[PDB]
Design an enzyme around this catalytic site. Structure first.
Site, PDB file in Angstrom:
ATOM      1  N   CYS D   1       0.968  -1.252   0.092  1.00 15.00           N
ATOM      2  CA  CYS D   1      -0.128  -0.097  -0.059  1.00 15.00           C
ATOM      3  C   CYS D   1       0.766   1.300  -0.162  1.00 15.00           C
ATOM      4  O   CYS D   1       2.102   1.406   0.505  1.00 15.00           O
ATOM      5  CB  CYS D   1      -1.137  -0.037   1.188  1.00 15.00           C
ATOM      6  SG  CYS D   1      -1.350  -1.571   1.967  1.00 15.00           S
ATOM      7  N   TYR D  82       0.654  -2.143   5.702  1.00 12.34           N
ATOM      8  CA  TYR D  82       1.693  -3.128   5.850  1.00 12.34           C
ATOM      9  C   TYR D  82       3.142  -2.779   6.348  1.00 12.34           C
ATOM     10  O   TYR D  82       3.529  -1.654   5.864  1.00 12.34           O
ATOM     11  CB  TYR D  82       1.863  -4.213   4.881  1.00 12.34           C
ATOM     12  CG  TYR D  82       1.344  -5.510   5.019  1.00 12.34           C
ATOM     13  CD1 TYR D  82      -0.144  -5.908   5.508  1.00 12.34           C
ATOM     14  CD2 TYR D  82       2.243  -6.649   4.742  1.00 12.34           C
ATOM     15  CE1 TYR D  82      -0.401  -7.237   5.864  1.00 12.34           C
ATOM     16  CE2 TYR D  82       1.756  -7.925   4.907  1.00 12.34           C
ATOM     17  CZ  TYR D  82       0.370  -8.339   5.512  1.00 12.34           C
ATOM     18  OH  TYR D  82      -0.120  -9.534   5.909  1.00 12.34           O
ATOM     19  N   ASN D 175       5.092   1.061   2.704  1.00 17.77           N
ATOM     20  CA  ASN D 175       5.420  -0.220   3.655  1.00 17.77           C
ATOM     21  C   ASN D 175       6.808  -0.226   4.072  1.00 17.77           C
ATOM     22  O   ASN D 175       7.538   0.810   4.324  1.00 17.77           O
ATOM     23  CB  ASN D 175       5.427  -1.241   2.753  1.00 17.77           C
ATOM     24  CG  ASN D 175       3.942  -1.559   2.275  1.00 17.77           C
ATOM     25  OD1 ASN D 175       3.444  -1.146   1.191  1.00 17.77           O
ATOM     26  ND2 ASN D 175       2.879  -1.410   3.207  1.00 17.77           N
ATOM     27  N   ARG D 228       7.868   2.732  -4.479  1.00 17.55           N
ATOM     28  CA  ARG D 228       6.796   3.617  -4.298  1.00 17.55           C
ATOM     29  C   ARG D 228       6.898   4.821  -3.294  1.00 17.55           C
ATOM     30  O   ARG D 228       6.252   5.737  -3.549  1.00 17.55           O
ATOM     31  CB  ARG D 228       5.539   2.351  -3.718  1.00 17.55           C
ATOM     32  CG  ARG D 228       5.581   1.644  -4.773  1.00 17.55           C
ATOM     33  CD  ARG D 228       4.174   0.672  -4.587  1.00 17.55           C
ATOM     34  NE  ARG D 228       4.804  -0.559  -3.704  1.00 17.55           N
ATOM     35  CZ  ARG D 228       4.356  -0.346  -2.321  1.00 17.55           C
ATOM     36  NH1 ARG D 228       3.965   0.714  -1.826  1.00 17.55           N
ATOM     37  NH2 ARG D 228       4.830  -1.375  -1.677  1.00 17.55           N
TER      38      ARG D 228
END
Lengths: 334, 334, 334, 334
Positions: D1, D82, D175, D228
């Site tokens: 995520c 997470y 994460n 990310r």
């Protein structure tokens, strides 16, 4: 700068480093004999007598010898590396401890410790202070790395929150940030391996590598500290084990060649070129010191144990900045 | 393999290359004297008499001397490099031309041409054929690079569609794919420079580089041919101009150290290690040949012009695979 | 811009594209009915009557409708994309051929061809000329992509050396350089896969991924044409097959979302922001046209076959630049 | 995520996140009314009465509502993400505190805090325990992020050494690893900008970008957590400021589209596909909840304040997994 240590199949421990700076202060290989004595501060006259003789690359431009890296008669190896933006020094020693100039840590540690633990212990009675020196005009931001005759390596970082100690690390150290950041960074690159990717297809198109080397896709080729860390660690992992001390020196210099900066490829804000002035290797068990410099790819060796370790004076070896080409026939040296 | 050529401020032209292979066929530096004569095909006994004497790295394992790279008495420099998946050879010579083993192109070109144009011309009467050789057991996939005494460089690629010629190129060449592909690839990396990024902010957070080197963000650090192309080209662009031939040899070897593969870091599908067996440099005006090998960082020089170019026999110089450490004091050679 | 085509498990062919520009000329979805007629040149009054009706995104600002992309009543799909620095147009038509403005190629092709071969054929009687248009003030540098009802895709590039045609390609196309350059570039990235790297060790240190995703190490994240090519191709290869046309449209928009440029992240030299003005999808067998725009993520559909293809007039659909949020309860629309 | 928060020019705070998992547990948008009461542990029946009503995405599969993310009636926003390999939970509560299931932290925090400081405070009386849940079968490794009506953001990480709190951070969170690691990582990428590199030369060759986009050279395009992080942070930095709440929702979804994983592009060791199940945005001042899901790009809104916050029951909104295409004319819905 970059640095790593390896273990041979011979049960030899070796440590190596590159020196990357914008200027070459007069440096030479220096032998410091036992009981020569080393200053703690440059503005204080307290001299700690050194128990051990040691050899390395340093400067003789201030009161006591300044060592950049080096080996002991005991087998302890270590080096000073830059740690810009992170290294933090106090103004006065913490209560009880005596202050030490960051530039004298290697000489003090090498003159007096045997193991990585000895090093950790010895530093509890000192406080790194913000004392400048007349060579740079300031106290350089530094972090430190040490390797035992056993092959155990540590990292000492003078952080904002105090001295951070890293025990039994992977034996690789370059510049900022902190050792833990770099070690965690390795995880994102575990897919950089020696082996080629399997061929794939895109519809009817066969896709295959241009040649060899494609297992490394992802390793960065720039000269930043983080990028250099990755390259020294991954290539330390995958280049063959040294079978003896000589293979060790040449393997170490091969790994570091992937982080060797040619003049002109890295410029500071100031526009100064940051390049690899020299490259050295040390062997803990033999106490030999090896080095090559920018202008000479011929490796030169000095043995510590070959000299008188109780000499009163420093035993120095000057740099030969000419390229030592061997003539097979009458070349015209030009 | 990787290769590039530079121009000194002295008006000297130098060419250099790395030899990356999985095995070391007996190679030595070979001088080929005028009128020695070179085969064109290994299964045919036609011998072309060579007008010029030349020196380089090669093999003496087949009928005529096989040269990997080299210089002329006329100043022409060149080398054979791998071109896997792209090199294409015919079965029979095209109408009018004579067939040539791809492995004999450098010897023939060096023995007979002066300029890059002479090279282009000489090849119009030949057809590279799929003739194997007893060293590799097959005809290696290869492309060729040549550099004049003037500094003009060309690239000749035996493509599927025929010989492709690249005139006055950037003077860099590694392996596949084709020259035009790599030269276009440079464009994606023009932002790889010596200079540091400006500092930025993220809200109230000040973001600054870890140290020096960040201008290179983007350059790949793996050993693929494309990656190696970029590295040699960008570092050729930014390392300082050689002021003379010696600086030229050392600058050349510095640039190529960024593409120097340590044993074990690149493995084939076969599991064989692809590593830098040797590294050589040549000067067009002095006709000097320089080399270092995997196990010895000491550069060795042979002068072509110092020998009798009308000797009947080949004048050879063997490799010294021991690390030529210079002892400053009595080291214990171990 | 970026573009690709997929095949569903339904035997449906779909094509999609992003439109990345610095300005939004009035564009709308346009239906061009059979026998509407299209100019060939803007400064000449010859009108070619179009056999087929077609639908897509375009402009009505010049004499004949300008289409950016679209589908036929026959199932031919295609789009115009930028090809800066590479597109080359002649001054006068080549002998025999008639001149065509580069901006009218899609309308002409879509109004008159059925297969990719029809397209290749139709262009042999034309010469793309350097005729400007009053919207941009110049003739934009463009390359073209077309996809059949069968799913066969081609690429037409007006290069310096003439029209280059690429037959049955991988069905991906972004901007410069040429199709063959990008297709070769795929080979350096075959190691970018969906699967995680195996865990490794460094001495006693266990190294494992941060989480999921590490198989992609190597794919570039920037918005350059080459990087966008890679991303669309690799994600086209690994995202699941569309089971039907709706899955196809949403899968196509997912792939292209990795090459969607938010306003402000890319600026020109001029300081203009290059962003994804819209994103469209087309289905060859249904002749449906789908689109979303920057300010509205809700997909809108127009069916070509639902209108009268013999209408005298153009049937247009305007853009709704408001975000079409669905209120589940009484939201306060702010 | 992935997750980030922005500030509009309207003085509105918005928070957004992507949900990337291998399976879709029944989730729906859930409104939890005041004094509904939330369990602390799933194996203990102590219920803490919640002062505030709140809306977000969650599950109703266990005793108390599980929220993944959401907004308050007070403006506090937050989400669970997470934190594999890093999240550490205790077996029994630390002395004095009560145990809390890591899965109930958002519900508890959202039902009872107003500011980021309230959050920090509330957690000092709890100890996250290793209590599993029947949905996953284990206690998921998680870290947490919260954003005030003021725009102040924090990160709470349950580390091996205890809860680590990050105050007023950059407002980005993905994460593992830890927040400080990612924030330091930003520094290696400060050269990733919107602006094009200057053109350079290589001898006589002019080198220019393929088109637009080359300032991003260096940004990674893979879907690892670190990559990310970078992408959300750098694109959060450079995409234009939201002028109001709607621009804010659409800007948020544009930035996160760079980290949107298509089904099939990421697979676990297990071979399961890790994809972006949904994407949501929240506005602190309006208390509106927005979301899109994998199969529908149409954004759907629920207003918290529009319902009765003293209802006895949960007010839920189900997902519409069909692509909400708007038909402009009679499309054939296929």
């Amino acid at each position: 700068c970059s640095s790593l240590s390896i273990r041979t199949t011979d049960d030899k421990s070796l440590f190596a480093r590159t020196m990357d700076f914008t200027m070459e202060p007069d440096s030479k290989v220096i032998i410091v004999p036992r009981n020569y004595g080393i200053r703690l501060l440059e503005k204080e006259n307290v001299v700690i007598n050194n128990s051990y003789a040691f050899v390395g690359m340093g400067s003789t431009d201030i009161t006591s010898p300044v060592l950049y890296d080096g080996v002991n008669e005991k087998g302890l190896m270590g080096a000073m590396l830059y740690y810009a933006t992170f290294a933090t020094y106090a103004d006065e020693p913490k209560k009880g401890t005596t202050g030490i100039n960051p530039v004298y840590v290697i000489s003090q540690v090498l003159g007096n410790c045997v193991t990585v633990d000895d090093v950790i212990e010895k530093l509890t009675s000192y406080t790194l202070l913000n004392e400048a020196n007349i060579i740079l005009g300031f106290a350089p931001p530094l972090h430190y790395t040490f390797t035992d005759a056993s092959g155990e390596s540590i990292v000492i970082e003078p952080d904002k929150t105090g001295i951070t100690i890293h025990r039994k690390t992977i034996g690789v150290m370059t510049n900022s940030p902190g050792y833990e950041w770099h070690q965690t960074n390795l995880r994102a690159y575990i897919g950089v391996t020696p082996n080629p990717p399997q061929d794939i297809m895109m519809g009817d198109l066969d896709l295959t590598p241009f040649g060899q080397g494609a297992g490394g896709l992802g390793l960065p080729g720039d000269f930043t500290p983080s990028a250099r860390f990755l390259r020294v660690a991954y290539w330390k992992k995958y280049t063959e084990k040294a079978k003896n001390e000589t293979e060790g020196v040449t393997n170490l210099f091969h790994i570091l060649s992937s982080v060797n900066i040619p003049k002109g490829v890295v410029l500071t804000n100031e526009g100064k070129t940051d390049y690899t002035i020299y490259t050295s290797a040390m062997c803990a068990q033999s106490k030999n010191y090896y080095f090559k410099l920018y202008d000479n790819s011929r490796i030169s060796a000095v043995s510590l144990m070959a000299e008188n370790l109780n000499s009163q004076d420093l035993i120095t070896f000057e740099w030969d900045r000419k390229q030592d080409i061997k003539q097979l026939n009458q070349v015209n040296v030009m």
